Amino acid sequence: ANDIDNSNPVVQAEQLNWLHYLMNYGSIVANDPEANFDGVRVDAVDNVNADLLQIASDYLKAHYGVDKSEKNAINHLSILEAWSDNDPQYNKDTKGAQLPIDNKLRLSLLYALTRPLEKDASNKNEIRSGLEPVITNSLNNRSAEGKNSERMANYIFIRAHDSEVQTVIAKIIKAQINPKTDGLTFTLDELKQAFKIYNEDMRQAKKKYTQSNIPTAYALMLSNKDSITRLYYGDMYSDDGQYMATKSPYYDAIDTLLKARIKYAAGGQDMKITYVEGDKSHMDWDYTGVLTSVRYGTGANEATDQGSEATKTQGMAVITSNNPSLKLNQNDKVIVNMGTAHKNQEYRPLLLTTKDGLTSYTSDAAAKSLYRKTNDKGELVFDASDIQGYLNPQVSGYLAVWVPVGASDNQDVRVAASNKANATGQVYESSSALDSQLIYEGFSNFQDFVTKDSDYTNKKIAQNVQLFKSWGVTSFEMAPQYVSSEDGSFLDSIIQNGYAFEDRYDLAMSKNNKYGSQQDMINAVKALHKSGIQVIADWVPDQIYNKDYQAKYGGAFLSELAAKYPSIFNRTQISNGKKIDPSEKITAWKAKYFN
């Protein structure tokens, strides 16, 4: 493991050369422009690598014109891995071309929904919070008093390949397999033993290790205005085993929410907590907060907006408690204001919590008899017969989603990208068009190695494109495709592909990666493009492991890039106070380019 010296202007030129290779991989290697990557995931890791964010952003502007229209920006959707303590402000202050993480809301969701109650807990900080932070503690404050400040473009997730997976396995191994584990380094046999317990724990009502209320997390993220959700592979399927071989217990609930977002999620948003009095004598944790989140549908931005009759079948309500023992007394009410656009209108449940889990309703007719009609002010009223705390595999508390009756089967409330430049001059301005995008992180670190060729991740991706389309996936984030090194160090033990590599330019070419052959990779990218889904490339310029493809392609494109995109070469970089130096090609990594 060697840290690359990204303060060196010749290295900075090589990192640009590599970015160009990844995004034009099809044209350069396969002579096939349908096998190119559309967007990039930038993972700079360290503050010393700051300059690479401006180099990447300058390339995306010059090559794709992402700064010249919303359309160009949305058609090359790019993201920033968690980097600084304020990625949104840093990306804005620099004129950067990547979506930042809404890290504040990610932590608000984890601590309000997924952590255990006080009794069954690790320490004071791993105690489940109230729901109040889910409204206010976000890059975009969604309270009545906070929603009117400038909105910031962002992506949100509850889990990822590198987030809220390994840390759970580490707990299981330390508790039950190998006390005196140092985390970080595990054997394949330790992982296999841990994943048997992990998979059992995830399917239980009482979760010792895994996250509570994952469906509730998705209901809130997918219905939120001014955000793009990144769906995690491991929330739909098992984090271990063959690719897409076993569904997660949460598959059906999240599938229901993904389809409903396309059909109903539009117009303005209001969020509110109602503190019911409660029974208390029949309650453990005394928290009586019930969160509601309403979308008004196209044409209505506020509770008082009229809308039109042609938008009546849009909008939705999410109702949630995070308290498994919540009981309303017989006088308690939760009022949900669906808006003045939704007076005297029939609503039916999409999702309801029961003793056993979540009931999903695939049509209006499936839920006839559960129909409820708003009053002349546009209010639904729920009481003790509707809302109750439950403890089941799906829910710790209560989850309901309500939708207006009468939507057509193929109703789609998503908005096309504007052809105009953003007035604010940002690459990504928060909008209904940007909210219409959804990213899928389509891999887990802990996928099993294949038994036969038919198991390969990249073959399965090409075979299931229409499933991804039905979920509203506009951007598919593929695993890093670099041929893996084989040694002691977690990225090499599980061969997650890139992350641990000896050749930056070797994408399943000297041999298969974990995910299949060069042709399997190419065909997955082509299949996704044929149904209009973008593919994101994984740009990881921090490290390299120790006549390859670095030799063939190293510095090969700098002449062409200098001729076409001079703006990239004219910038004086902040950290070293120098322009990038393309006068030397890096055809082999040596000590001179490390630290």
Author numbering: 423 to 968, 1006 to 1054
Please quote the authors directly.
Streptococcus mutans, a known etiological agent in the pathogenesis of dental caries, expresses three genetically distinct types of glucosyltransferases (Gtfs; also known as glucansucrases): GtfB (GTF-I), GtfC (GTF-SI) and GtfD (GTF-S). GtfC synthesizes both soluble and insoluble glucans (α-1,3 and α-1,6 glycosidic linkages), while GtfB and GtfD only synthesize insoluble glucans (mostly α-1,3 linkages) and soluble glucans (mostly α-1,6 linkages), respectively. All three enzymes belong to glycoside hydrolase family 70 (GH70), which cleaves the glycosidic bond between the glucose and fructose moieties in sucrose during catalysis. While fructose is released, the enzymatically produced glucose molecules are sequentially fused into a growing glucan chain and, depending on whether a 1,3- or 1,6-linkage is formed, the resultant product is either an insoluble or a soluble glucan, respectively.
The new structure of the catalytic domain of GtfD affords a structural comparison of the three S. mutans glycosyltransferases. Initially, GtfB-CD, like GtfD-CD, underwent proteolysis during crystallization setups at room temperature, which we only identified after the structures had been resolved since the gels after purification appeared to be satisfactory. Unfortunately, use of the classic protease inhibitors AEBSF and PMSF had no effect on GtfD-CD. When the models were rebuilt after obtaining molecular-replacement solutions using homology models based on the GtfC-CD structure and the GtfB or GtfD sequences, it was clear that GtfD-CD had missing residues; in fact, the final refined structure of GtfD-CD lacked domains B1 and IV. Our current structure of the catalytic domain for GtfD lacks domains B1 and IV (truncated at residue 421 because of proteolysis). Unfortunately, the catalytic domain of GtfD is not complete since crystallization resulted in the structure of a truncated protein lacking approximately 200 N-terminal residues of domain IV. Although GtfD differs markedly in primary structure (52% sequence identity to GtfB and 61% to GtfC), it still has remarkable similarity in its structural elements (the r.m.s.d. to GtfC is 0.69 Å for 3292 of 3959 aligned atoms and the r.m.s.d. to GtfB is 0.69 Å for 3274 of 3962 aligned atoms). GtfD in particular shows several different residues, with one prominent residue (Thr589 in GtfD) being the decider for the type of glucans (soluble or insoluble) that are formed. The truncated model of GtfD-CD is likewise similar, but our attempts to co-crystallize acarbose with GtfD were unsuccessful due to the absence of key binding residues in the abbreviated GtfD (residues 421–1054).
